[PDB]
Amino acid sequence: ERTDIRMAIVADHLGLSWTELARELNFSVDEINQIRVENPNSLISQSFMLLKKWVTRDGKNATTDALTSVLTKINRIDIVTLLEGPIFDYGNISRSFA
Numbered sequence: 574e575r576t577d578i579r580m581a582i583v584a585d586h587l588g589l590s591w592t593e594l595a596r597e598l599n600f601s602v603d604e605i606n607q608i609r610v611e612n613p614n615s616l617i618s619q620s621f622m623l624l625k626k627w628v629t630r631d632g633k634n635a636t637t638d639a640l641t642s643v644l645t646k647i648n649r650i651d652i653v654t655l656l657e658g659p660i661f662d663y664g665n666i667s668r669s670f671a
Contacts, residue, residue, distance in 0.1 A: 579666050580624045583640075586652050587620035595623050597643040628670045635671055637664040 587594060595605050600623070608626070612618035628635045641653045641664075657664055 576666050576670055579661060580628075580670060581617075581621060582655070582660070583652065584617050584621035584624055586655065587623075587649075588616045590647060590649050591616065591620035591623050593647045594620075594643055594649075597646055598623075598627055600626070624670070632671050633669050636669050637661065637666065638668065640670075 584591070592605055595608070604626070605623075608619050608622050612622055631639070637656050641656050644650070644652045644656070655661060
């Protein structure tokens with residue numbers, strides 16, 4: 574539940590960026606379309622389910638560090654500082670979101 578709360582926070586900040594995060598995470602346009610179809614009225618819902626699929630997919634490799642690398646690439650540094658800051662125990666959700 575704690576880990577879910579943290580993903581929700583990320584998802585809230587993501588907004589429209591989630592599709593760019595997904596792309597950088599090497600998700601396909603089909604996978605992105607599907608997330609949007611399954612979560613039609615909420616960018617936050619969409620971003621949250623992207624984060625969930627990422628964790629299901631990459632498991633132990635779904636790390637705070639993997640995330641900040643991509644978020645840096647797509648110019649969402651505001652989320653990087655969040656992930657590196659005290660609210661995220663300085664990168665320790667418990668380092669992986671799994």
